[PDB]
Design an enzyme around this catalytic site. Sequence first.
Site, PDB file in Angstrom:
ATOM      1  N   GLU B 357       0.945  -1.087  -0.099  1.00  8.98           N
ATOM      2  CA  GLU B 357      -0.099  -0.070   0.097  1.00  8.98           C
ATOM      3  C   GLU B 357       1.036   1.281   0.417  1.00  8.98           C
ATOM      4  O   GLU B 357       0.258   2.232  -0.773  1.00  8.98           O
ATOM      5  CB  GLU B 357      -1.104   0.318   1.114  1.00  8.98           C
ATOM      6  CG  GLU B 357      -2.056  -0.999   1.311  1.00  8.98           C
ATOM      7  CD  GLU B 357      -2.958  -0.815  -0.319  1.00  8.98           C
ATOM      8  OE1 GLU B 357      -3.287  -0.035  -0.858  1.00  8.98           O
ATOM      9  OE2 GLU B 357      -2.987  -1.958  -0.641  1.00  8.98           O
ATOM     10  N   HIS B 487     -17.362  -9.309 -11.046  1.00 10.35           N
ATOM     11  CA  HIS B 487     -16.934  -8.674 -12.300  1.00 10.35           C
ATOM     12  C   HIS B 487     -17.551  -8.597 -13.300  1.00 10.35           C
ATOM     13  O   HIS B 487     -17.789  -7.058 -13.538  1.00 10.35           O
ATOM     14  CB  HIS B 487     -15.298  -8.487 -12.879  1.00 10.35           C
ATOM     15  CG  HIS B 487     -14.537  -8.439 -11.567  1.00 10.35           C
ATOM     16  ND1 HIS B 487     -14.700  -9.954 -10.388  1.00 10.35           N
ATOM     17  CD2 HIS B 487     -13.462  -7.881 -11.011  1.00 10.35           C
ATOM     18  CE1 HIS B 487     -13.513  -9.786  -9.189  1.00 10.35           C
ATOM     19  NE2 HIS B 487     -12.766  -8.485 -10.052  1.00 10.35           N
TER      20      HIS B 487
END
Lengths: 196, 596
Positions: B357, B487
């Site tokens: 991150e 998705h």
Amino acid sequence: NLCPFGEVFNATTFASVYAWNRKRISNCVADYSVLYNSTSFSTFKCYGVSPTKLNDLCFTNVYADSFVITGDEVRQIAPGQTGKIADYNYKLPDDFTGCVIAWNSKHIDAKEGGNFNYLYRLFRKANLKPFERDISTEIYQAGSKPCNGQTGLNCYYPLYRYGFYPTDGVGHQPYRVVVLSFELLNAPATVCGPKK
Amino acid sequence: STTEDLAKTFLEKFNSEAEELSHQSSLASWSYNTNITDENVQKMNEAGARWSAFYEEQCKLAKTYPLEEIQNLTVKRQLQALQQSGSSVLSADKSKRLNEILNTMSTIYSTGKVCNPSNPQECLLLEPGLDAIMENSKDYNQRLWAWEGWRSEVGKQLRPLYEEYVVLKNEMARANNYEDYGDYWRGDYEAEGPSGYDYSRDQLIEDVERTFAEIKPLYEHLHAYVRAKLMDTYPSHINPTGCLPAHLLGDMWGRFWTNLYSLTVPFGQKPNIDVTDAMVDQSWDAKRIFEEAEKFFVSVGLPNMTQGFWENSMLTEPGDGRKVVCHPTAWDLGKGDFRIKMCTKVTMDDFLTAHHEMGHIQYDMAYAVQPYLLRNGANEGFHEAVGEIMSLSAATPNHLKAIGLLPPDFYEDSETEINFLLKQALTIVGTLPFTYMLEKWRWMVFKGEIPKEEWMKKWWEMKREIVGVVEPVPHDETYCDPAALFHVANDYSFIRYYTRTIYQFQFQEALCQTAKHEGPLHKCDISNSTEAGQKLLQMLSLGKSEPWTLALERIVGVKNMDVRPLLNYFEPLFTWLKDQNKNSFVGWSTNWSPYA
Ligand SMILES: *[C@@H]1O[C@H](CO)[C@@H](O)[C@H](O)[C@H]1NC(C)=O
Ligand SMILES: [Zn+2]
């Protein structure tokens, strides 16, 4: 009597850079040591003079110009600079004689929801001459088509808001700038350094 | 006042206002995400709908500067992002209907329910319960009813909507002068640029298919190795020359083979390197974890974290009754404001995630000098690629000895490296044929090369041919199995996971050769190599201001995707896998079916 530097530096609120304030100093004794020998200033740069020699000098006027910009823009309050501030808000001359002083003012000029009280000019037909001031709010006509005081495709309002928040990065935080300029004319020199 | 003159000036009014509005939206999102209240979700929505209204106006205003009069490619790339408007080109009817179709598929998916046949009162949603079966069960028949029920009860509802969805999306894409909805999505890899850096939307299909054929060998061998190992678990139901049954693959779809690790681990008596206990013994806290991440990025000459990053991030679950979103996210709030939100735990997983991150944050910090519109990854696959290579270095025992989480006399077992490369392959290599074939089906559906009379038929032909995976129950055209994946039901492009994975190892191999790394690629720790950091900053600072081909070449020295760095990462596993399979069939015949 002593010079009212406290009134400019410790003023509660500062001007927008596009309408930068100018205070004339006259008929007083200024101890510049309370400034340079202080540790409150992230920028203290002098151009026409030496700062430690300023206590032995006498001028006819001293001008203190003050305003607020972002940290990344303090760079532009210098001789031979360019950019949105130098071009259209505050212009310092090549032959600048004086000092540029700046500190981070986040604590006093950023507020929780965002402080939008400080404005700047984004568009102008031409660059400012040194120490010029423009406070008009005429519609900037970018194209051949006249605007008639109406905003539209190529017709832009020229003043825009800074938005200062306590959580912005250092580069975007508000900075208070005091530009002291000096001048020695054919007239009594009343602003002097402290006399022995 | 030429067209470029005016557009430059138009973009100056845009940046100052867009920066302000996006900044308030980003701040309100943060107040909501770190404190879920109805007050904060109000301010969020009000703030995001101020931005969208501003954006939509500025979008049609930017169509006033015709692109063909803009020489400066920098001005053009900005104007390009503003003249994309999307579904606003439909009529009020056709666009309202599309949005309502999208919301119906999405909620059918999140409320989808299947019940146990052996116990009809035992019903489950997907995300808590059915996944738990799909990621843990070794029972052929239990996985089967969860797999088949998910596509019968949920996937059959999506079929008539998905047919309509295809039609309206293909209209929306044609009204924006694309061939179809697929060609529309591929425009994210389009690139106008100087001579030799252009990239067409049709180039992507070719570059995807080329790279994948180079992967087919490694995947076949991994496929055959996994297959031979599953026979021990499911002797009745596996054919050693056929496809793997689709419900035995470790999640609801076979998207990853990660959760096959327990069954397929090569050397089961060698444990994984887990430095969690080391961290806990050394009294590390979440603060210490991010300080080590910061230290790592400094070591390659990259910026510190700002003073504001430490003051404003959410690095631990608050636990004071304040309700938060614990998914780890890197926030680019604008105006030099960068934050990370995650509920960090003292674990080697969360240690690794922190490095990942923070890599997102470094990228954001590098392209903040760029105009507002070009502050993003070169294309949709760069950001997570940059993020993934941080975990690669931070996990190596070289790096784990340096920061003291392993003893200085740590023996690097060859058996552990094969355990490690295999675990990596099950996730990274297993998903690649799944990801390409899923997107290939959608691409062909949008072009019309698959008539809806043959949707499900061609879905399982390609599943068997490309992925080596076979349906355990026959599925006619009442089914819409692709829509049974989040998705597809939720209208996201999928090819990013393919291209990101390729980009990932191109990056790593280039910074490792710059670091003068010695051994096999998977043992590389770019730490303390400022030489490598500068090579990476050359790409990071660009944002999406340059065509992604040039951005890519600025770090790896080629203008296109290349899967050879991926294959040398897995090279010790490739040669090890060839040798295991030498006594058995390698490949699959696509004629056998479990139902037969
Ligand atoms: C402003 O006030 C502070 C104390 O509040 C003082 O130290 C400083 O010198 C003052 N500035 C001037 C220019 O007098
Ligand atoms: Zn990420």
